Design a protein around this ligand. Structure first.
Ligand code: CLA
Ligand code: CLA
Ligand code: CLA
Ligand code: CLA
Ligand code: CLA
Ligand code: CLA
Ligand code: CLA
Ligand code: CLA
Ligand code: BCR
Ligand code: BCR
Ligand code: SF4
Ligand code: SF4
Lengths: 218, 79, 119, 112, 184, 73, 86
């Protein structure tokens, strides 16, 4: 798809592409706004239509060009044109510098028609109820945005919910020994792979002690 | 005073006013000194609450922190 | 006399109900145009980014935002999950645990917290 | 001509609007039926029916106003003190409106 | 020691006997036929209505209607004599203690209303059960509707026989419980 | 080999967010493609707030319940 | 900007795409329904939030969900006309 050369509306006064329209106060507010949206189309007959900004208009038998402040007005006019069997209309966003961005028929095929090369953006692979609970994701990446969680996080919190209901079989986290641990950070033994072995043996000692203590009055 | 309401007029309820001053200017100034102290301390507290905790202080601030010996006990006593 | 406290009032009442409120309103409208204005509730402020990074620099709060933080030995967890999936893998299925988790972590939400691009 | 004036649509409530033809699935259907009752523009059939409905409804309302006038006239002839008001209007309050002596409603009628 | 002044005006029975459990033994109330406020109120009613009556002509129909109203007022005075009214208002009271045997008791109206209200609800429920369609709710099947309306008289027995035989209620796992509160 | 409930067979809905959760509805059709995640199509007598009386459910959200009966959803 | 998410229950109606007044939604090929297509929201930065897509969605509960974020509003999500934020 080739973007056209839509000029800035303040530099294209009196263009032959402009349809005959009455002109109202509803048009884009100059002297305060510099971002304009332009919609172009090619018609077959001078059929009267309604401008999104109040007032009616008559197309041209050839090319047409209109400028609007908002993309919504351009899309409304596009739907109105498409109701009149007028395809091949393109909607551009004009930056303040004059950069032309091609917006509505982005890949050249209207969004209601399946086109190859598209990928489901903002897709979630479950029913809407499958979203994780907001309470589970507190102070994580998804603090108040449980609907933004990746499906792996949703499954992880679901498994956590499943686990944290069998209370008797849970493992209480041992209380840290603050007074005798906690040396200066430079005082470490390195041996990271040995540190997990130390984790294993210390947790084994904790579990054995807990079992021995429980097997006294239970 | 011009009273309003039925009960004040039909019971003769009156509002006495002391002919003296109440508090002398010196006492009011003494109260205003401590009010200014409260005001300065409250502005400082508002600043601290607005900025919040700075965790990156351990990279620049001197000292090495401190956990009081009871706070350690409260840590390891449970939750 | 019962008056003589109005000497304090004639200064304090005009001050605290006219001068202080006007100065406060002017200072508030000035503060509204700072880049730091309402940095705790308004998204995309510079100070919010600095505070988040300062929290992340603390050794305790490095991996605090990760929802999966906690696995003491993630290699053991992954190996056990792979072993359990091997015995339940349907017929000649070609999906492994590693790439399944990798593609279940990668979602496509470009418009999430995109306000972290101005400040 | 008049052979098409049939009662078959009296039982078929909501016939006039094609949005109500699906049947009363919800209670919103009742309120919509009452809301579209006089909206002749959106109801089914051609524009001639719109004109017929508008004009005939105007005539029906005119008959209703005439019936109201007739009721006022009969109240004045048979349920009023218009005689004594004619004889002495400055001492008699107009009254062509009585109340039955039920539930003590008799207390509403006053000396005119 | 004068409980009236001790409690700021209100008086206490101070006696523990079953004979005082009836409403008629209350010291707040008093039979209407020997209460001064009752006499004064209904005398004022008679006086006002009579004063209105004299304003009209003697031979008019309004005079006869006011005579009928006066007779109704006097009949009301003599009919409420056995009804209990407070020793300070004169307005007769309604008994809501389940007495079943006092003037103005609320047990008889309660029983009558509960019977007829259960009748209405049972007739409606029977019609809804026997017409399991929306078309039958807008276009009422009048023969079936009046059949259910007449059949509703035996509701206090049929409803209980359905309750105990598992034909009124439905297990919660067969109707929509409500909005989901969890899933993750 | 047919998969899912038979056509015209009543099923109880097990989708918690469904308007017809724990209700019953006839099975219109079941899509036989294994790639379809929600193949079971169920129609209901009671329409939801969108005035829609039919919806497609997953294979694990219909339990083949009996007929509703008199005065029962 | 709001957050418009499409869920697996989509059946490729295309009604949500047609109802959108700012071309936020589009149809992408897929293999999870008989229509072989699901909706997508590649341009939610233009989502005003009218929720017409939710009105048009016929699934039991909407396969497309729009989450309003008022402390997030941009000039496009507010439909600003008299004023430019660029
Ligand atoms: C009546 C005397 C008075 C009062 C009440 C204050 C109060 C304040 N000053 Mg201030 N100041 C004073 C005298 C005073 N100062 C004098 C005499 C000087 C000259 C040396 C300054 C110079 C000064 C500077 C240079 C700065 C302050 C700032 C502040 C604010 C810091 C608290 C905070 O974090 O708010 C955070 C902000 C808010 C919660 C927003 C609302 C606050 C608005 C502006 C006022 C609300 C007042 C309200 C009606 C009660 C606080 C509102 C700091 C600030 O944040 O500026 C706004 C700042 O940078 N003041
Ligand atoms: C709850 C606190 C409080 C409140 C609501 C008031 C209210 C009042 N005082 Mg006052 N006063 C207070 C505490 C307070 N006083 C204290 C503790 C002192 C001793 C220092 C005084 C000394 C004082 C004098 C000498 C005079 C008043 C006067 C007045 C009246 C005029 C307002 C004014 O200019 O005050 C000015 C008062 C001050 C500057 C003193 C400090 C005010 C308090 C301590 C601040 C509390 C603020 C509170 C936390 C709310 C903050 C949030 C706010 C932005 C919503 C008004 C009825 C005047 C008047 O006409 O009285 C008849 C007057 O002449 N006051
Ligand atoms: C000559 C007078 C006249 C005529 C011919 C019409 C005709 C019409 N109006 Mg209209 N209108 C009028 C006066 C009139 N209006 C006035 C004075 C107002 C201002 C209040 C309106 C406000 C109005 C609105 C807002 C709307 C219409 C609509 C309509 C159309 C359909 C009406 C309908 O189906 O309602 C059916 C009739 C009813 C629902 C009547 C119900 C009774 C009313 C609502 C309550 C009255 C309470 C009562 C007075 C007090 C009760 C006593 C109490 C003691 C119990 C129709 C073309 C509607 C439309 O879509 O137009 C195309 C529409 O939306 N009109
Ligand atoms: C359209 C205007 C209108 C209005 C508002 C009324 C209103 C009233 N009329 Mg009335 N009336 C009207 C037209 C009207 N009428 C007409 C056109 C005639 C001539 C046929 C009468 C002949 C008439 C008589 C002969 C009597 C009334 C009576 C009454 C009153 C009681 C009605 C009653 O018992 O309910 C009856 C309710 C129904 C029949 C339900 C249907 C009431 C204030 C009565 C009255 O005032 O008693 C003192 C009474 O005796 N009216
Ligand atoms: C709960 C007690 C109660 C009861 C049983 C009644 C019953 C009655 N009142 Mg009533 N009323 C009450 C309380 C009550 N009211 C109160 C509290 C007030 C004070 C606001 C009134 C004030 C009042 C007045 C002022 C009048 C009535 C009238 C009537 C009678 C005819 C109703 C009528 O005009 O229909 C009208 C029916 C039609 C017009 C038929 C229309 C039918 C088509 C389909 C439309 C009716 C017997 C009227 C009466 O007695 O007429 C002589 C009358 O004029 N009442
Ligand atoms: C919680 C309040 C409460 C409740 C549930 C009841 C319930 C009852 N009271 Mg009761 N009562 C109450 C307060 C209450 N009373 C109070 C405050 C007093 C005044 C002290 C009485 C005085 C009272 C008397 C005098 C009688 C009842 C009777 C009854 C029974 C009649 C109902 C029935 O089916 O008759 C069948 C019923 C069990 C009557 C009774 O015993 O009938 C069995 C009866 O004669 N009650
Ligand atoms: C004479 C004047 C009068 C009027 C106009 C009303 C009007 C009303 N009453 Mg009511 N009532 C009255 C006198 C009156 N009451 C008296 C004197 C008593 C005795 C103290 C009651 C006791 C009473 C109860 C206990 C209830 C009502 C209810 C109602 C409302 C529903 C109407 C109804 O039954 O629908 C027809 C009935 C149905 C559609 C469903 C059936 C429900 C009824 C109550 C049958 C239940 C029978 C059941 C087996 C026994 C229940 C025991 C216990 C729960 C009380 C209605 C506004 C109901 C209400 O307000 O609910 C919100 C209600 O539950 N009334
Ligand atoms: C003041 C309100 C009031 C009163 C006193 C009544 C009184 C009555 N209703 Mg009723 N009803 C009312 C309001 C009222 N209704 C309302 C608002 C509705 C809903 C529209 C109904 C719906 C209703 C039904 C469906 C039935 C009754 C029936 C009855 C009768 C009970 C049967 C009986 O005892 O044998 C006399 C009785 C005459 C029943 C009846 O007539 O049975 C034959 C019956 O089946 N009513
Ligand atoms: C005469 C008499 C009697 C009888 C009575 C009766 C029987 C009655 C009945 C009555 C009735 C039978 C009534 C009914 C009523 C009804 C009503 C009144 C209704 C209402 C409705 C409403 C109120 C609504 C509501 C709602 C809804 C719809 C939902 C949501 C929420 C709401 C709330 C909004 C006796 C003997 C006792 C005594 C004497 C007198
Ligand atoms: C005696 C008395 C009293 C008391 C009373 C009481 C205490 C009561 C209770 C009551 C109760 C405690 C009740 C409960 C209940 C429960 C339940 C659970 C119920 C149920 C019901 C039902 C279920 C119904 C059904 C039906 C019918 C039957 C008919 C109509 C239709 C229907 C379906 C609705 C008083 C004090 C007032 C006063 C005096 C007298
Ligand atoms: S309207 Fe709903 S079901 Fe239909 S294509 Fe859009 S998102 Fe999918
Ligand atoms: S809320 Fe409105 S603008 Fe946003 S995606 Fe839905 S239909 Fe489009």
């Amino acid at each position: 798809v080739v973007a056209e050369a839509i000029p800035r509306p303040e530099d294209l006064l009196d263009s032959p592409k402009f349809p005959m329209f009455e002109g109202s106060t509803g048009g884009y507010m100059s002297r305060s706004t510099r971002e304009r949206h332009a919609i172009t189309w090619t018609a077959k007959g001078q059929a009267k239509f309604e401008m999104p900004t109040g007032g009616f208009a008559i197309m041209n038998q050839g090319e047409n060009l209109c400028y609007f402040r908002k993309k919504e007005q351009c899309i409304a006019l596009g739907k109105q044109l498409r109701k009149m069997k007028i395809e091949n209309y393109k909607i551009y966003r004009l930056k303040k510098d004059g950069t032309v961005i091609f917006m509505h028929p982005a890949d050249g095929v209207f969004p209601e028609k399946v086109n190859k090369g598209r990928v489901q953006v903002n897709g979630r692979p479950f029913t809407i109820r499958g979203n994780p609970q907001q309470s589970e994701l507190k102070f994580t990446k998804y603090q108040g945005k449980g609907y933004e969680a990746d499906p792996l996080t949703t499954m992880f919190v679901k498994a956590r919910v499943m686990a944290f209901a069998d209370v008797p079989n849970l493992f209480a986290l041992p209380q840290p020994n603050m007074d005798e641990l906690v040396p200066a950070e430079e005082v470490d033994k390195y041996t990271r792979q040995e540190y997990t072995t130390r984790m294993m043996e210390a947790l084994k000692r904790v579990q054995d002690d807990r079992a021995a203590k429980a097997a006294k009055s239970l | 005073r011009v009273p309003g309401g039925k009960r004040t007029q039909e019971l003769g309820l009156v509002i006495p006013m002391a002919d003296e001053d109440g508090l002398t200017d010196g006492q009011v100034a003494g109260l205003f000194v401590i009010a200014l102290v409260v005001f300065i301390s409250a502005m400082d507290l508002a600043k601290t609450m607005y900025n919040g905790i700075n965790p990156a202080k351990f990279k620049t601030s001197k000292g090495k922190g401190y956990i009081s010996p009871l706070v350690k006990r409260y840590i390891e006593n449970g939750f | 006399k019962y008056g003589d406290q109005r000497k304090f009032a004639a200064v304090l009442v005009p001050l605290t109900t006219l001068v202080f409120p006007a100065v406060a309103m002017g200072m508030f409208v000035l503060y509204s145009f700072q880049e730091d204005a309402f940095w705790r509730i308004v998204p995309g402020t510079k100070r919010a980014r600095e505070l988040d990074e300062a929290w992340r620099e603390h050794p305790l709060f490095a991996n605090s935002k990760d929802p999966l933080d906690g696995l003491i030995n993630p290699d053991d967890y992954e190996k056990g999950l792979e072993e359990a999936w091997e015995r339940a893998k349907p017929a000649g299925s070609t999906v492994t645990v590693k790439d399944k988790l990798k593609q279940l972590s990668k979602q496509n939400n470009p418009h999430w917290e995109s306000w972290r691009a101005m400040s | 001509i008049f052979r098409y004036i049939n009662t078959t649509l009296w039982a078929k409530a909501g016939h006039f609007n094609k949005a109500l033809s699906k049947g009363a699935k919800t209670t919103t259907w009742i309120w919509n039926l009452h809301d579209y009752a006089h909206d002749f523009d959106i109801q089914q059939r051609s524009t001639g029916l719109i004109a017929r409905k508008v004009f005939s409804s105007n005539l029906a309302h005119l008959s209703l106003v005439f019936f109201w006038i007739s009721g006022m006239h009969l109240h004045g002839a048979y349920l009023s003190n218009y005689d004594i008001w004619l004889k002495d209007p400055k001492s008699i309050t107009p009254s062509s409106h009585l109340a039955y002596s039920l539930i003590g409603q008799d207390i509403l009628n006053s000396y005119t | 020691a004068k409980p009236l002044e001790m409690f700021g005006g209100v008086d206490i029975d101070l006696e523990d006997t079953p004979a005082h459990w009836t409403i008629k033994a209350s010291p707040v109330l008093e039979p209407c036929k020997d209460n001064k406020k009752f006499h004064k109120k209904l005398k004022d009613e008679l006086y006002k209505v009579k004063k209105n009556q004299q304003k009209f002509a003697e031979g008019s129909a309004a005079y006869a209607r006011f005579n009928k109203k006066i007779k109704m007022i006097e009949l009301r005075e003599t009919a409420y004599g056995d009804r209990l009214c407070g020793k300070k208002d004169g307005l007769p009271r309604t008994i809501a203690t389940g007495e079943w045997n006092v003037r103005g008791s609320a047990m008889w109206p309660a029983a009558i209303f509960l019977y007829i209200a259960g009748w209405i609800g049972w007739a409606g429920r029977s019609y809804l059960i026997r017409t399991n369609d929306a078309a039958k709710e807008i276009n009422i099947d009048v023969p079936l509707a009046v059949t259910c309306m007449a059949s509703g008289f035996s509701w206090p027995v049929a409803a209980w026989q359905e309750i105990v035989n598992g034909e009124m209620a439905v297990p919660n796992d067969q109707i929509h419980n409500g909005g989901p509160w969890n899933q993750s | 080999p047919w998969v899912g409930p038979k056509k015209g067979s009543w099923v109880k809905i097990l989708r918690p967010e469904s308007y017809w959760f724990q209700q019953r509805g006839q099975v219109v059709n079941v899509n036989q493609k294994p790639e379809v995640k929600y193949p079971v199509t169920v129609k209901f007598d009671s329409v939801n707030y969108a005035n829609v009386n039919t919806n497609g459910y997953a294979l694990w959200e219909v339990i083949e319940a009996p007929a509703p009966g008199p005065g029962e959803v | 900007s709001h957050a418009v998410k499409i869920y697996d229950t989509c059946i490729g109606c295309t009604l949500c795409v047609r109802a959108c007044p700012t071309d936020v939604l589009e149809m992408v090929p897929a293999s999870i329904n008989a229509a072989k297509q699901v909706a997508s929201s590649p341009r939610v930065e233009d989502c005003v939030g009218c929720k017409r897509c939710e009105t048009a969605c016929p699934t039991d509960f909407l396969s497309i969900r729009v989450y309003l974020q008022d402390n997030e509003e941009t000039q496009y999500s507010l439909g600003l006309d008299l004023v430019d934020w660029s």
